[PDB]
Design an enzyme around this catalytic site. Structure first.
Site, short mmCIF file in Angstrom:
data_model
loop_
_atom_site.label_atom_id
_atom_site.label_comp_id
_atom_site.label_asym_id
_atom_site.label_seq_id
_atom_site.Cartn_x
_atom_site.Cartn_y
_atom_site.Cartn_z
N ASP A 17 14.50 0.53 -52.85
CA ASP A 17 13.36 0.99 -53.68
C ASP A 17 12.03 1.02 -52.91
OD1 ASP A 17 12.82 -1.75 -53.43
OD2 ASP A 17 12.71 -2.16 -55.55
N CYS A 74 13.03 -3.07 -49.97
CA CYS A 74 14.25 -3.72 -49.43
C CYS A 74 13.99 -4.68 -48.28
CB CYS A 74 15.36 -2.70 -49.06
SG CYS A 74 14.84 -1.63 -47.74
N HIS A 81 17.26 1.76 -44.51
CA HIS A 81 17.62 0.71 -45.51
C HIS A 81 18.03 -0.62 -44.92
CE1 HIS A 81 18.72 -0.95 -49.43
NE2 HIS A 81 19.89 -1.35 -48.88
N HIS A 111 21.04 -4.35 -31.47
CA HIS A 111 20.43 -5.38 -32.30
C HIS A 111 19.10 -5.79 -31.76
CE1 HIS A 111 22.73 -8.19 -29.57
NE2 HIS A 111 21.49 -8.71 -29.53
#
Lengths: 248, 149, 76
Positions: free
Chosen positions: A58, A61, A240, A218
């Site tokens: 939204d 996150c 996201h 990462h």
């Protein structure tokens, strides 16, 4: 136009903070016929990670993911929660001194403190906490504290972070437009600020479609000479963030 | 039963004197407010009073208040339906902001009508090309529409 | 000529570049040192985002100028 009614209704068909789910649920979003590249990355990640916690997409996150991660450490570590409850009071005083609007920013702090104290005294159980993090009114009020300290950390350190902001914006403009409002995606600068402001330590598993270093892309934030294990791990997929957990 | 935010903001709105701005909760609905802003001294709006309506939507303060002028006004930031073009009402709204901030910013907007760019529409364009004359029309509309009973 | 690239991570690096170099080539030189691939990099100079199609000379980037590096981490 009830169009943003249906848009922000697609978002709301998932909980703010899901219950834990086996990591294999993430793998099942993908397949070899239509999404082979994602399937590979997910399957690889599932050798290290046993579970995923889906966060609603939204705009909040990242903040919600960090917040959930922190609250989880603090349910398991009474000392760390004491330290976080106190150092949050240091933020209130920092906010009102860095000239954030007084009673509004104070009320977010007060609500967050009371929430933590109620965990500390045992008034709130584990169950009650997740219910609170899933109730829009309360969860977003709690999340605002985190947007506020992210903004404060940048303002506190403005000459240092100023050059990492584009579009000709000052630090104050960036905070006002991209950090303080709700529903605004977090980017690197904001992410760096929250983690440092919150005194946490995060690994982001950067899951995209590209050929990658062994183990996958990462980023550790902070990244320093020390080799302390990260206390929160996030899954980043394009646009996201979710929360993930090492096996056992 | 209202959230804590609206209870606290209501109390502040009732206690705080703000020059040229009066704000009251509707007697029936606690999220609904009636606002009157005086035309500021040294603007074309001088002498007029402007009624505004403010609603705190369900998710407030996470979403912006809704504000509209009821009083017709000739201004680059306000259209025929009294809708308001203002950054802190859409994109630069944050929950650290409050009703007071919006009202003060609408007041300052009346005092400095020329925002460099034509927010909306024919009115704004009239304002940059011939200020003197836009200012005159604004003065006339103030006499026609904002002059009470 | 030498230029610097400052990172949020706390590190500064140096690169050997030509004013002719495209922003793409610069990102590749960062990659050779760091590992960070170009499509994960955003470079900023003087509050302006540097565009892949363009050169250092296009932005009048000079010897010993410092560029700022952020990662592409935008998420909701």
């Amino acid at each position: 136009d009830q169009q943003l009614k249906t848009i922000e209704d697609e978002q709301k068909s998932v909980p703010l903070v899901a219950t834990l789910a086996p990591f294999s649920i993430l793998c099942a979003e993908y397949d070899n016929e239509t999404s082979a590249a994602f399937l590979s990355k997910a399957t690889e990640l599932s050798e290290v990670y046993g579970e995923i916690r889906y966060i609603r997409g939204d705009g909040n996150c990242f903040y919600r993911a960090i917040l959930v991660g922190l609250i989880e450490i603090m349910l398991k570590d009474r000392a760390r929660l004491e330290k976080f409850i106190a150092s949050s009071r240091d933020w209130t005083r920092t906010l009102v001194e860095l000239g954030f609007p007084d009673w509004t920013c104070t009320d977010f702090c007060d609500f967050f403190i009371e929430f933590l104290e109620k965990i500390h005294s045992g008034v709130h159980t584990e169950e009650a906490v997740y219910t609170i993090l899933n109730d829009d009114g309360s969860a977003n009020y709690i999340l605002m504290f985190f947007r506020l300290i992210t903004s404060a950390f940048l303002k506190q350190n403005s000459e240092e972070y100023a050059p990492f902001i584009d579009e000709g914006m000052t630090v104050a403009q960036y905070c006002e437009q991209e950090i303080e409002p709700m529903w605004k995606d977090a980017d690197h600068l904001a992410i760096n600020s929250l983690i440092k402001a919150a005194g946490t330590r995060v690994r982001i598993e950067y899951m995209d479609r590209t050929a990658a270093p062994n183990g996958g892309w990462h980023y550790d934030i902070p990244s320093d000479d020390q080799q302390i294990a990260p206390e929160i791990t996030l899954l980043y997929r394009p646009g996201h963030y979710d929360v993930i957990y090492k096996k056992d | 039963g209202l959230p804590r935010r609206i209870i606290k903001e209501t109390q502040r709105l009732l206690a705080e004197p703000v020059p040229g701005i009066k704000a009251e909760p509707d007697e029936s609905n606690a999220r609904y407010f009636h606002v009157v802003i005086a035309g500021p001294q040294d603007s074309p709006f001088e002498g007029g009073t402007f009624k505004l309506e403010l609603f705190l939507p369900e998710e407030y303060p996470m979403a912006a208040p809704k504000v509209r002028f009821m009083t017709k006004i000739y201004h680059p930031n306000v259209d025929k339906l009294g809708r308001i073009c203002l950054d802190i009402l859409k994109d630069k709204w944050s929950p650290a902001l409050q009703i007071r901030t919006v009202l003060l910013s609408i007041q300052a907007l009346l005092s400095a009508p020329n925002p460099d760019d034509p927010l909306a529409n024919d009115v704004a364009e009239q304002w940059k090309t011939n200020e003197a004359q836009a200012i005159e029309t604004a003065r006339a509309w103030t006499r026609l529409y904002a002059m009470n009973n | 000529m030498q230029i610097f690239v400052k990172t949020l991570t706390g590190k500064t690096i140096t690169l050997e570049v030509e004013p002719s170099d495209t922003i793409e080539n610069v990102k590749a030189k960062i990659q050779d040192k760091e590992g960070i691939p170009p499509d994960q990099q955003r470079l900023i100079f003087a509050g302006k985002q540097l565009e892949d199609g363009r050169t250092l000379s296009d932005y009048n980037i000079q010897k010993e100028s410092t560029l700022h590096l952020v990662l592409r981490l935008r998420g909701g």
